[PDB]
Amino acid sequence: AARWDLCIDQAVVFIEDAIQYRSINHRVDASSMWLYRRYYSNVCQRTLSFTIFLILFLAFIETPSSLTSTADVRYRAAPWEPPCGLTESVEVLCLLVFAADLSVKGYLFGWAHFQKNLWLLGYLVVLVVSLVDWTVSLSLVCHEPLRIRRLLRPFFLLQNSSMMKKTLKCIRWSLPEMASVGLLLAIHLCLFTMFGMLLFAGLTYFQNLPESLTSLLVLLTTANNPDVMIPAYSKNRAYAIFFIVFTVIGSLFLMNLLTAIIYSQFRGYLMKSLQTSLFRRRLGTRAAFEVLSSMVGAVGVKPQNLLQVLQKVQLDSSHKQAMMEKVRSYGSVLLSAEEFQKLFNELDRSVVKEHPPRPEYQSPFLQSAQFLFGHYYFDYLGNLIALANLVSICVFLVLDADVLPAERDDFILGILNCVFIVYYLLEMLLKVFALGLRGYLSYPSNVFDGLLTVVLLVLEISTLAVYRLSLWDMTRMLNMLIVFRFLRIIPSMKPMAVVASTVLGLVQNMRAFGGILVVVYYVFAIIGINLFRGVIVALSAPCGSFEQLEYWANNFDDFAAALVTLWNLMVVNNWQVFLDAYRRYSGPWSKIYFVLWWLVSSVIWVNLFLALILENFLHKW
Amino acid sequence: AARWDLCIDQAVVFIEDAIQYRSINHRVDASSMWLYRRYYSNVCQRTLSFTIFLILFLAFIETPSSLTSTADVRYRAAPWEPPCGLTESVEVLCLLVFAADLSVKGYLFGWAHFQKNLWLLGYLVVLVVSLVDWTVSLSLVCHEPLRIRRLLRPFFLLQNSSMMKKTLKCIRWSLPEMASVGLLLAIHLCLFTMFGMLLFAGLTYFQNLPESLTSLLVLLTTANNPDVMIPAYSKNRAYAIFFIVFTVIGSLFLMNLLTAIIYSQFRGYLMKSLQTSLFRRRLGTRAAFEVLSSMVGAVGVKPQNLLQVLQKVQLDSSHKQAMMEKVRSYGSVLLSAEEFQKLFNELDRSVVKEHPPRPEYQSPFLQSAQFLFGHYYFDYLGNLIALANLVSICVFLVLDADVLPAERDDFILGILNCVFIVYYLLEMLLKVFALGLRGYLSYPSNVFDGLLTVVLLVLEISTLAVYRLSLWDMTRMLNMLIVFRFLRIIPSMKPMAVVASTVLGLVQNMRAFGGILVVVYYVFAIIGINLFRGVIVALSAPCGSFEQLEYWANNFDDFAAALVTLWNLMVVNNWQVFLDAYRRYSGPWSKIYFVLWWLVSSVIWVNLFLALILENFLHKW
Ligand SMILES: CCCCCCCC(=O)OC[C@H](COP(=O)(O)O[C@@H]1[C@H](O)[C@H](OP(=O)(O)O)[C@@H](O)[C@H](OP(=O)(O)O)[C@H]1O)OC(=O)CCCCCCC
Ligand SMILES: CCCCCCCC(=O)OC[C@H](COP(=O)(O)O[C@@H]1[C@H](O)[C@H](OP(=O)(O)O)[C@@H](O)[C@H](OP(=O)(O)O)[C@H]1O)OC(=O)CCCCCCC
């Protein structure tokens, strides 16, 4: 009856879930399995992965606008303030796509599963309180600067991906073991300020208690390492032993225990979670076996239906072709459950595909050429001339600088460059014969090479059309692309190839743990906008201050300058100066914001991002 | 005959070599085994370990002398130049102790073993060329500044210790696998200077090729991270993406691959060498079995001689007592070789020793007290009052600063401090009754506590004798010791105890890999003296230069200021300024010295020192 195909559609959903590591917890009906295949297709999810990009992009356009060519305070125009209809209009279109998504994700699962899963409760309460905020931002007037719904926008990014859920749970089970050091770092920082204030009371860095605390917090990351030593080391030579002992205990040892203790528990709890992701793979092969053995209602499956199921599944070609021969390889056997999971080990075989070389209408001139050009020396001799073009730019660049920069001689550089553009033209025209245009475009290193020979050919005739011999600007862009062209020797050489190829593999694991950085920037910038928006005005400074250096571009006026001021605080150089500005301009209690940013960004996250990659880099050798 | 005791003295030397991991490769005679026990005793080797400290200490006294209270150039006196007899006289006494050491180490081993061992050849040629240099430094006159024998002085430190030999071999088998990145870091640094010079040619950091190279080398370690961005980011907002991409590739990723690749091969080759050190331990038990089984000339040993051999060996008490009962535990058994190495597994048992509490002549008042004081709460309530004394200093220190620092009120702090000195007096006088003076001095935490109660008692009556109520200076040293006293809560608390106790265990492994830092400082300081000795003279500066900041104390005039200028270069903050000074003062070719110092100190050594400790810290949990 109708139980034949219903067992089949119960089997296609399980084996496709067995590929992409999703939990087998559904409300399996006839109609829902039509809905399930459409939601996890690459046409519906590529709009959900597109609209999350749009709402985070909407911070570039809102009323503290960032569409200005500069970012100074001394000279910048007014940014184009948009009319306040179109700002909030594109928000509500991108919220009525998540209003469909929560209803689909909730209908496909049980209501009992809904009440136990705390993400979907959090996906609910965030969606409602944003919808109340969209009313009140329209209802009174479009003049409220404080937009609370802008803070909740990274929650839609964390809800989508299934690995940023895992590593956020993973950080929570490592911070309780941090407290044996975070207490130990506090007593070390608190004893040295009282011991520091008594020694130099018989320099202006220690004439106060909150200054001497904030001057040893800066020394803890060595951001002012000679400057805090000088007026006490010049007085007596033995006072340098106070600051030598402090940086050895605190900066070199205690700050590095905070890295190693957090990571060694981060490695333990993560591998337990990634072990769970492998468990759902073997359950999908297991759950497919139960319904297909129930098609009879020995202990096995009839191979006649097994042609039909792997025909319908979404896969590659050779992954489908090897499976379709092996199900044809048997007759009337009853494929057991261990034999069923003997079958699906094919999915971990990396495959290679290449196109055949092209012949011509003639024999003898054809065969003599591809014996030479395919020997991987023709793109080795092309590497040497790429170095020959690069040194001529360097020879040009060290003789003009001894003269005024008005470029007395440009003709010599032009008549050597145009020869090399003819040379780069011959590499494209010859190799397309040696491999065929479908084969020459198949290798991705030649796509990077073949594209740049086109743009150099376009630009060289362009400057020769106007100037038969902006002309300094036109020959400037020509030489920049040649230095960009020199990157081709990185995949070509033998030792540089494997270090490039492994990092290209780790981009499929950078997608998860790099996505948290977008969450941490987005929270601190909007809070950073709503605290220091217009607190810097520019209307003879001391030589070390925020004003003597021309640091006016590191404001917090708009979302594009907030993501650069927060960048120069992640690298921890010279952040004694921002604590001098944003204390003198916006009160002494602003230092809790920057100290919290130094704890989240440059201590916890950056080390745990690089330890996660550079372990997985060397593990893959 | 005389073969009885000769087999015995052949057995004492092997089992003592089985304890301290020395190779069983000797010229075993009758007379040499008298010499061998004296050379590896703790009375001869504690002079060899003392005279190596002396020659490195002699750099503090030689003719660029470092006996000056300050280290400026603006104001310092002439250092006391010693008469040139006594400088070179103490050197030759410390060279005629190594002239005995090479002859003893060579006579005890074979001449065939001498020719194959390259350390003893290096110990020879260094010893001779220093002896020629001691003549020529005396023979013409004591006026040659260049002392080549001062460079060779760390070789006597590397020759003595048997683990700095191992890790120096270990670094050599990791640098060949560095070259896949050191080439990759060079092309990345060389492409960005030509691409950088063309973009800003349509700021003064890029108007030259050697300046733009040395300005991106500084950016590679983020020592000038906002300062190099400013004049191009204020011009146009999109130019910040040039410096964001550069620090992500180079500073955060490529500089960290240089740490992880070197360490992951440093971990591999070191554990192979430490495995070899365990191999000599089981050979010493094996080589002792062969001679004692040859005392018969079943398959075993007679236990009658085995009382005599472990009686003569140098060991501890319980390590000797447990062995002396087990050899007495058997009768006429023939102890086999596996039974012989069944015996010597006792040497890996950490032992505890404690002294009994002391009673008095009376029963009832005695028993009521030690039920209370030994409950580890009496030194918990002592921790709270130590926090109560510390907060009163903090309450004092935040109210004087709002006034002028002439200390209007000191009487209030004095009449609370003297109460706490009586309180700290009662902790010593009561606990010495509760445990006995031999037991109270047995625990090392009470030695640190009991000593500071004496010095506070000495100082408190001292300021009260002169001043019945320098007096600000006398009450200053009193409050400093109280903050020093607060360190006692670190071993007392539960979570802080295990993090303190493990690092105290790692000092017996810090002795090896920390000794290389003394070699790297000693080479670069003497070279640093002989290149920039008197090249800084002080006779309105730009606001960012070496002269506006008062950096005059970071000279290279003497060996004590060289070890501080090299310290502020190991921490890599503000070393753009030294490259501005020591290029403008001593030629542009001095930058090879500082760049080589940044490669050896703050890239290779510091990371490999901390990765070696903080792995072994967390491995011991
Ligand atoms: C904003 C108003 C309230 C909203 C707050 C929302 C907070 C919230 O619901 O999370 C609950 C879940 C727990 O619930 P839980 O369900 O366990 O969280 C994960 C998801 O279920 C995930 O399901 P998939 O999406 O299908 O992958 C599963 O794979 C993971 O298991 P695994 O580890 O074996 O891989 C779970 O760890 O995770 C937390 O425990 C939060 C800890 C956050 C750490 C903070 C770091 C500072
Ligand atoms: C100055 C004029 C010339 C003098 C130069 C002297 C250079 C020199 O003789 O060393 C030879 C030995 C090789 O000879 P080698 O004997 O193998 O060096 C070690 C010692 O014998 C050591 O003997 P003990 O003292 O009894 O402990 C032994 O334990 C180690 O084995 P192990 O690894 O299994 O623990 C050996 O690695 O070690 C080098 O291979 C030098 C590499 C230096 C790396 C430089 C780093 C940049």
Numbering used by the authors:
A (entry chain B), B (entry chain A): 39 to 240, 252 to 346, 354 to 525, 539 to 608, 620 to 701
Sentences from the paper on this structure:
Two-pore channels (TPCs) belong to the voltage-gated ion channel superfamily and function as a homodimer, with each subunit containing two homologous Shaker-like 6-TM repeats. However, several recent studies have demonstrated that mammalian TPCs are sodium-selective channels activated by the endolysosome specific lipid phosphatidylinositol 3,5-bisphosphate (PI(3,5)P2) rather than NAADP. Like other TPC channels, HsTPC2 functions as a dimer with each subunit containing two homologous six-transmembrane domains (6-TM I and 6-TM II). Here we present the cryo-EM structures of human TPC2 (HsTPC2) in both the ligand-bound and apo states, which reveal the structural basis of phospholipid binding as well as its activation mechanism.
Interestingly, the single particles of HsTPC2 in the presence of PI(3,5)P2 can be partitioned into two classes of particles, and 3D refinement yielded HsTPC2 structures in the open and closed conformations at 3.7 Å and 3.4 Å resolution, respectively. The 3:5 ratio of the particles between the open and closed conformations in the PI(3,5)P2-bound structure of HsTPC2 likely represents the ligand efficacy of channel activation. The HsTPC2 ion conduction pore adopts both closed and open conformations in the ligand-bound state. In the open state, these constriction-forming residues dilate and rotate away from the central axis, resulting in a much wider opening at the intracellular gate. In the closed state, the IS6 helix breaks into two halves at Gly317, just below the cytosolic gate, while in the open state, IS6 becomes a long continuous helix. Upon ligand binding, the Arg329 side chain adopts an extended configuration to form salt bridges with the PI(3,5)P2 phosphate groups; this interaction provides an outward force to pull the IS6 helix into the straight conformation; meanwhile, Ser322 forms a hydrogen bond with the C5-phosphate of PI(3,5)P2 to help stabilize the IS6 helix in the open conformation. In the ligand-bound, closed state, Arg329 forms a salt bridge with the C3-phosphate, while in the ligand-bound open form, Arg329 forms salt bridges with both the C3- and C5-phosphates as well as a hydrogen bond with the C4 hydroxyl group; additionally, Ser322 forms a hydrogen bond with the C5-phosphate only in the open conformation. Between the two IS6 residues that interact with PI(3,5)P2 in the open state, Arg329 appears to play the determinant role in channel gating as its mutation (Arg329Ala) almost completely abolishes channel activity whereas the Ser322Ala mutation reduces the channel activity to a lesser extent. The movement of IS6 from the closed to open state results in the outward dilation and rotation of gating residues (Tyr312 and Thr308) at the bundle crossing. Interestingly, we also observed two long stretches of density plugging the open gate in the open HsTPC2 structure.
